């Protein structure tokens, strides 16, 4: 994918139940695997901001639930550094449902998104109300 300007620690590993913060009907999704991630022996799949993960909808509408979907993490509590040396951290972790190409299934994103994801996937930025 296109490189991000910031250095992102892959903070969320497989099994994490993240709140889903768009209007698709998924409330909580559990990370199953990370796309484009090859691991090593004994290492759980890891994801930071800007990564696309395969998720399972654990809470939300009954139509969304139990579906294997693609999501992009837009907020992470683990601090990441911008190129100019400033460290950024969010109050929670948050993801949004998308396709393979990166288009969000939802139409509006409640909460701030990271500028890194906003630039890597421009449609997430337009869908989000504010980009931090």
């Amino acid at each position: 994918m296109k490189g991000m300007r910031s250095n992102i620690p892959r903070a969320l590993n497989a099994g994490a139940q993240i709140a889903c913060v768009d209007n698709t009907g998924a409330k909580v999704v559990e990370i199953i695997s990370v796309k484009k991630y090859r691991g090593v022996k004994n290492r759980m799949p890891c994801a930071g901001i800007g990564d696309m993960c395969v998720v399972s909808v654990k809470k939300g509408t009954p139509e969304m639930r139990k579906q294997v979907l693609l999501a992009v993490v837009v907020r992470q509590k683990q601090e990441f550094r911008r190129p100019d040396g400033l460290h950024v951290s969010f109050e929670d972790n948050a993801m949004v449902i998308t396709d393979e190409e990166g288009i969000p299934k939802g139409t509006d994103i409640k909460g701030p998104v990271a500028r890194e994801v906003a630039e890597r996937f421009p449609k997430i930025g337009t869908t989000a109300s504010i980009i931090v």
Partner: protein, 180 residues
């Protein structure tokens, strides 16, 4: 299996637990009025009928509801296409469990004359319908009229997963009987 539940119970006796159970088994609770209140005051999230029909609210506690064209979804098979599709339409929901009891009618006698006007006034019009509709579903929708059968239901679900035909039958019949 139960995915959504319409809990418009006049008599609220023990609805809190049934609700808790369903929620814990994912079952979204689409309820309105008294029930809805108690449930949201007892730590159970409940969606309102407003987010189903296109009918707001008025004199919550008896009628205010119904479901035309649309009741034919739950009807006698909330999965039978021709049947199914009707109840879920535009933002509507495919509730597969409805529990609607009806407060027993009573006229009594007041100090100044039989209170006919109000007494008769409170003849639940919505409730009974929801019942008959759901009830007809000898399959799909599992009607829970009588309040003294939340246990049986819960247990079955928690275990088995699907309220057996036998049970569905008993329940439905009982509902029809209640309206009778």
């Amino acid at each position: 299996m139960v995915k959504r539940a319409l809990l418009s119970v006049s008599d609220k006796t023990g609805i809190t637990e049934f609700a808790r159970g369903l929620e814990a088994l994912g079952v979204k609770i689409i309820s309105t009025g008294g029930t809805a209140k108690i449930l949201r005051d007892a730590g159970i999230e409940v969606t309102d009928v407003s987010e189903v029909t296109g009918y707001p609210e008025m004199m919550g506690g008896r009628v205010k509801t119904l479901h035309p064209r649309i009741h034919g979804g739950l009807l006698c098979l909330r999965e039978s296409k021709e049947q199914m599709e009707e109840a879920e339409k535009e933002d509507i929901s495919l509730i597969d469990l409805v529990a609607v009891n009806l407060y027993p009618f009573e006229i009594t006698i007041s100090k100044e004359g039989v209170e006919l006007e109000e007494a008769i006034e409170n003849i639940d019009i919505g409730g009974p319908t929801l019942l008959r509709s759901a009830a007809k579903n000898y399959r799909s929708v599992t009607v829970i009229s009588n309040p003294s059968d939340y246990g049986h239901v819960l247990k079955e679900l928690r275990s088995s997963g699907i309220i057996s035909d036998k049970t569905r039958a008993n329940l439905a019949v009982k509902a029809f009987r209640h309206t009778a």
